[PDB]
């Protein structure tokens, strides 16, 4: 129910290895800057 | 659920007010103690 020992800096960052976001899937707008793929401009 | 403090202007003044304190020697002792300590509020 509770941590028996505190988590070291090393273990914490090891666990955060995969905690990240990825670059959006984006494409240049041929006529109308960049946009999400399969989305309309909605602002151009 | 019902709690202990049920406010009542009249009750509060009659039990803890200035005149009730002046009414007994021990109440006057309370006022003297509070004046000696330098309290802003001496009674209700």
């Amino acid at each position: 129910a509770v941590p028996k020992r505190r988590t070291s800096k090393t273990r914490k960052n090891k666990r955060r290895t995969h905690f990240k976001i990825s670059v959006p899937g984006m494409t240049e707008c041929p006529n109308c800057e960049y946009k999400l793929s399969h989305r309309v401009c909605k602002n151009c | 659920v019902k709690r202990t403090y049920q406010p009542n202007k009249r009750k509060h003044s009659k039990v803890h007010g200035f005149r009730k304190r002046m009414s007994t020697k021990n109440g006057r002792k309370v006022l003297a103690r509070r004046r000696r300590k330098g309290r802003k509020v001496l009674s209700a």
Binding site: L36, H38, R39, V40, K42 | -
Partner: protein, 120 residues
């Protein structure tokens, strides 16, 4: 079919509201899942309107809301009348596919995918 995070009665009512709003405004912005669900409702309604008979009109009245639409100049009509009038005539020679969905991207408040669904 999708549940849309609602009970059956709530989901049915929301789908009726969305379908009537689409019929009235011809172009609405909603979430992705709601639009994917309502495309079927709206297109089956348009099928009934193309059928045109009295029984089809009453079956359509089971689903449509009772809303009024002020047209060009102070002339009113119901959403059912528009569905069996202008909308049905617009799609006489089109065999299905009366709507399209255009994705807009996430919105600020909850990251939900906003889309436009419009009549074709």
């Amino acid at each position: 079919y999708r549940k849309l995070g609602r009970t059956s009665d709530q989901r049915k009512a929301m789908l009726r509201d969305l379908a009537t709003s689409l019929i009235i405004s011809e172009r609405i912005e909603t979430t992705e899942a709601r639009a994917k669900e309502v495309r079927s409702v709206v297109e089956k309604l348009i099928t009934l309107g193309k059928k045109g008979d009295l029984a089809s009109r009453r079956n359509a009245a089971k689903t449509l809301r009772n809303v009024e639409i002020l047209n060009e100049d102070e002339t009113t009509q119901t959403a059912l009348q528009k569905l069996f009038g202008e909308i049905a005539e617009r799609y006489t020679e089109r065999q299905g596919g009366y709507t399209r969905i255009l994705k807009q991207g996430p919105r600020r408040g909850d990251g939900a995918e906003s889309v436009i669904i419009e009549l074709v």
